[PDB]
Design a binder for this molecule. Sequence first.
Ligand code: CA
Ligand code: CA
Ligand code: CA
Length: 187
Amino acid sequence: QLSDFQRNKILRVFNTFYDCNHDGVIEWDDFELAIKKICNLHSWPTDGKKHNEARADLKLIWDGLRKYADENEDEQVTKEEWLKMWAECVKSVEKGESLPEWLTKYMNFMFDVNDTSGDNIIDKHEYSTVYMSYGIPKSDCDAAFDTLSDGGKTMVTREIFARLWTEYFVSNDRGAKGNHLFGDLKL
Ligand SMILES: [Ca+2]
Ligand SMILES: [Ca+2]
Ligand SMILES: [Ca+2]
């Protein structure tokens, strides 16, 4: 199963990015929250393309996560179910098979949220603008971004971001740069 390192990486994300209302479970309510949070960030109209567009993708993502981790079918993902899922989902990515569809779907969703200007590149400002809005300190965005972009040597494109996403969730390597996808970890 998952090491202390992996567990904590998987939990850190649960508590930070998924459990918006901060009550200890994931539900549709946390997603209506995200949508609000990102609209406030980018000043999208409550009813524009981006708002409804985003509401569609999250309905998909949620529907994906929950037909996947919600063993007990009550429309709620517990940390217990989250971890139980990730356990087998991880040992299955290190046996050859790729991620679940909903998880790629969230990754593209996140990428598009970052890539404000829409040139297919996350620049340092766009990055810190997002991740500061989830509580990650400005300095942990700068330390992170220098790692993910490789002091400027690598362009953070949709493709590169997806590969860092997988490293984050699955790698048991402390040296792996995808570890700092969501803000700098002291390792
Ligand atoms: Ca919640
Ligand atoms: Ca449940
Ligand atoms: Ca950009």
